[PDB]
Design an enzyme around this catalytic site. Structure first.
Site, mmCIF file in Angstrom:
data_model
loop_
_atom_site.group_PDB
_atom_site.id
_atom_site.type_symbol
_atom_site.label_atom_id
_atom_site.label_comp_id
_atom_site.label_asym_id
_atom_site.label_seq_id
_atom_site.Cartn_x
_atom_site.Cartn_y
_atom_site.Cartn_z
ATOM 1 N N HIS A 62 0.989 -1.272 -0.050
ATOM 2 C CA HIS A 62 0.120 -0.037 -0.005
ATOM 3 C C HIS A 62 0.708 1.349 0.155
ATOM 4 C CE1 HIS A 62 -3.097 -3.223 0.793
ATOM 5 N NE2 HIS A 62 -2.206 -3.180 2.235
ATOM 6 N N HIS A 92 4.810 7.429 6.657
ATOM 7 C CA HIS A 92 4.930 6.936 5.213
ATOM 8 C C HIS A 92 4.341 8.077 4.424
ATOM 9 C CE1 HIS A 92 1.194 6.168 7.447
ATOM 10 N NE2 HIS A 92 0.457 6.515 6.117
ATOM 11 N N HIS A 94 2.009 9.325 0.422
ATOM 12 C CA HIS A 94 0.916 9.203 -0.489
ATOM 13 C C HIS A 94 1.219 10.156 -1.679
ATOM 14 C CE1 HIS A 94 -1.812 7.123 2.237
ATOM 15 N NE2 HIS A 94 -1.277 8.097 3.144
ATOM 16 N N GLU A 104 -3.505 13.638 0.248
ATOM 17 C CA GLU A 104 -5.004 13.090 0.786
ATOM 18 C C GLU A 104 -5.709 14.280 1.458
ATOM 19 O OE1 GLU A 104 -4.265 9.781 3.743
ATOM 20 O OE2 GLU A 104 -4.974 8.678 1.794
ATOM 21 N N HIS A 117 2.932 11.422 6.436
ATOM 22 C CA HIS A 117 2.215 11.228 7.776
ATOM 23 C C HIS A 117 3.047 10.617 8.748
ATOM 24 C CE1 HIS A 117 -1.801 10.905 5.664
ATOM 25 N NE2 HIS A 117 -1.466 12.040 5.294
ATOM 26 N N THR A 196 -6.527 6.730 6.919
ATOM 27 C CA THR A 196 -7.187 6.799 5.603
ATOM 28 C C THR A 196 -6.924 5.645 4.835
ATOM 29 O OG1 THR A 196 -4.866 7.851 4.937
ATOM 30 C CG2 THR A 196 -6.448 9.313 5.779
HETATM 31 ZN ZN LIG Z 1 -1.416 8.061 5.517
#
Ligand SMILES: [Zn+2]
Length: 258
Positions: A62, A92, A94, A104, A117, A196
């Site tokens: 992910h 991590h 995104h 996000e 994050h 999320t």
């Molecule tokens: Zn995250």
């Protein structure tokens, strides 16, 4: 056929396995800078990452996490809208397939190239697994990344991405200092939200820094070279692993500045 970001298992499908996906305090959300309330009762954030101990980097399918030793108050986050101490456990990103998307959280509907994050859990609950089961169990520090100049402190993370190309892979990643990923200012916004990614638990207190950090097109480009798949399986590039904005509903976004 488990969750993901594809057409058939994307965020618009998650509610079927995780009914809370349509909950009351889901994340991310669009941050409206003109409706956000300036709360002068908020204390400044206190980030103590001086004794931070990184351990491993991993591709979970992910996103890639950089894990830390949380057996003690080594890297903690306090102050702000937080009560008690929160321990850094992992961070991590995104990102999108293009520089015009990836974050996000959005500011005035504006999308950044990516979002970092740093995940922390309330030490009062003993461990991470118990924390996620509390309304104030987690505190996540969000940081927007825009494509511009290079961020030196992020280069070490980038170099090892080749060694964790696919799902499952992990590599020792010691002596990394997260303080090099912080912006100059710690002004932020804050609101009660959720993770999320499934289970999408609503145990997070979001702290989204106002000031983004710059990373070069070359740095973000290497993130996109990652695979969702595992070794030996058809290749699916890890891009656009962000969840769209969710309804703000009965919530207000407070700022620590004006
Ligand atoms: Zn995250």
């Amino acid at each position: 056929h488990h969750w993901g970001y594809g057409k058939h298992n994307g965020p618009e499908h998650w509610h079927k396995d995780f009914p809370i996906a349509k909950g009351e305090r889901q994340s991310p959300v669009d941050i409206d800078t003109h409706t956000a309330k300036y709360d002068p009762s908020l204390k400044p954030l206190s980030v103590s990452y001086d004794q931070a101990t990184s351990l491993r980097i991993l591709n979970n399918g992910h996103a890639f996490n950089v894990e830390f030793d949380d057996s003690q108050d080594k890297a903690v986050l306090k102050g702000g809208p937080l009560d008690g101490t929160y321990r850094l456990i992992q961070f991590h990103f995104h990102w999108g397939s293009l520089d015009g998307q990836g974050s996000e959280h959005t500011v005035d509907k504006k999308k950044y190239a990516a979002e970092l994050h740093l995940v922390h859990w309330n030490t009062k609950y003993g461990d991470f697994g118990k924390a996620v089961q509390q309304p104030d169990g987690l505190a996540v520090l969000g940081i927007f990344l825009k494509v511009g100049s290079a961020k030196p402190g992020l280069q070490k993370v980038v170099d090892v991405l080749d060694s964790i190309k696919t799902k499952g892979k992990s590599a020792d990643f010691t002596n990394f200092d997260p303080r090099g990923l912080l912006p100059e200012s710690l002004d932020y916004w804050t609101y009660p939200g959720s993770l999320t990614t499934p289970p999408l638990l609503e145990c997070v207190t979001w702290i989204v820094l106002k000031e983004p950090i710059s990373v070069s097109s070359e740095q973000v480009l290497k993130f996109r070279k990652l695979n969702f798949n595992g070794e030996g399986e058809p290749e699916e590039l890890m891009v656009d692993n962000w969840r769209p904005a969710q309804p703000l509903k009965n919530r207000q976004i407070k700022a620590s500045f004006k």
